[PDB]
Ligand binder design. Structure first.
Ligand SMILES: C=CCNc1nc(N)c(C(=O)c2ccncc2)s1
Length: 290
């Protein structure tokens, strides 16, 4: 904008570009997202202005929404690093379990809050989980699909997409976020993406190959879904101890519940917080190189 100075470009999206900026007047440093077009749909600006009220310590604060000259600016509190970068930097050593558990616990708290207020993220990924030096981790760049929908030179990653979305479900439930967070949990533990699909069908088949091709037994209604094909190959579920070694049984149990095929059987964020895995949760600080 004009009340700001683009320190640097910190991100790219199909929607818009993200900049680290400094408020010429208040001096506060923020992340600024710029978006495209002929009048900007209002049904969007309303679901957006509503997110300005969704305040929680584990949700990146949306400071302002500014619609001007066919441009939409979202001003957010700035964090210094995202989990994707932190994982790459911790890849040789691995994030210590206590920190993984603390991050998973905080993210479930952020989701429990969003979900209790009927708001879904829809596009959780390491790149939009932001961390600070205080040991906090926060949810950012909400999918605002209910605000806009589902999305140059920016291929959308499908690695964290819940199976019901890939199968063409018309209505997303809060379970899509739990699925995405389970995939992230597995990735933090193993230091490798759980289901790195490079196309929608490849994404779906990688999930099937690991968790077994779903059927009416484990997911009632699955065979009636829009993109379900009877011709899908039938893979047997793989031994789950092979999925996230060396994660302990409490962690494996919780992950397995976050990855249930049936959105109705999938654990909620609130129930996940009560899982035995968090009996010894603590809040360590990460070592950050900024
Ligand atoms: C991760 C380091 C840069 N600092 C950031 N800080 C914040 N708050 C960021 C975002 O809210 C964000 C917006 C749109 N897409 C992705 C992230 S990015």
């Amino acid at each position: 904008m004009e009340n700001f100075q683009k320190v640097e470009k910190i991100g790219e999206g199909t929607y818009g570009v993200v900049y680290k900026a400094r408020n010429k007047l208040t001096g506060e440093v923020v992340a600024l997202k710029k978006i495209r077009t002929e009048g900007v749909p209002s049904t969007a600006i309303r679901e957006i202005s509503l997110l300005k009220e969704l305040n929680h310590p584990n949700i990146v604060k949306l400071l302002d929404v500014i619609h001007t000259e066919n441009k939409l600016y979202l001003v957010f509190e700035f964090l210094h690093q995202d989990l994707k970068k932190f994982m790459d930097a911790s890849a040789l050593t691995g994030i210590p379990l206590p920190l993984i558990k603390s991050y998973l616990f905080q993210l479930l708290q952020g989701l429990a809050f969003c979900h209790s207020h009927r708001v879904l993220h829809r596009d959780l990924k390491p790149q939009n989980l932001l961390i600070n030096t205080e040991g906090a981790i926060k949810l950012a760049d909400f999918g605002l699909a209910r605000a806009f929908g589902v999305p140059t030179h920016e291929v959308v990653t499908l690695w964290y997409r819940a199976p019901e979305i890939l199968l063409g479900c018309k209505y997303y439930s809060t379970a899509v976020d739990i699925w995405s967070l389970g995939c992230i949990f597995a990735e933090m533990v193993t230091r490798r993406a759980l289901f790195p699909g490079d196309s929608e069908i490849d994404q779906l088949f990688r999930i099937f190959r690991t968790l077994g091709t779903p059927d009416e037994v484990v997911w009632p209604g699955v065979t009636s879904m829009p993109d379900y094909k009877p011709s899908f190959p039938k893979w047997a579920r793989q031994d789950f101890s092979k999925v996230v070694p060396p994660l302990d049984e409490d962690g494996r149990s919780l992950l397995s519940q976050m990855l249930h095929y049936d959105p109705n059987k999938r654990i909620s964020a609130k129930a996940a917080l009560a899982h035995p895995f968090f009996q010894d949760v603590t809040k360590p600080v990460p070592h950050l190189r900024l």
